[PDB]
Amino acid sequence: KVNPDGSQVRLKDVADVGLGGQDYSINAQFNGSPASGIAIKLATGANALD
Amino acid sequence: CGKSEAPPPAQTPEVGIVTLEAQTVTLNTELPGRTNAFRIAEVRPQVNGIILK
Incomplete structure (x- = not known):
């Protein structure tokens, strides 16, 4: 909000903005070290090796 | 019978370095x-x- 005498308050003090995660529910570790992955399910009626 | 095409081991030259001071x-x-x-x-x-x- 901005008052007409030049006074103002922005979204800098009342909140802090950070490029964070979208959902913090699930997270993965590989041999203790933090990582991430995507498991793929094969399509119905498709060969595996190719 | 070939025996060529070795990759050039580039030094990554011409780097634009400027040091800074207080x-x-x-x-x-x-x-x-x-x-x-x-x-x-x-x-x-x-x-x-x-x-x-």
């Missing part, structure tokens, strides 16, 4: 505001009556 500078702050008159006098009447002129 330096003192003054800091500034931009602020919003309005200009105002140094002396503004609005004329109010001290009697009652009709303005003739």
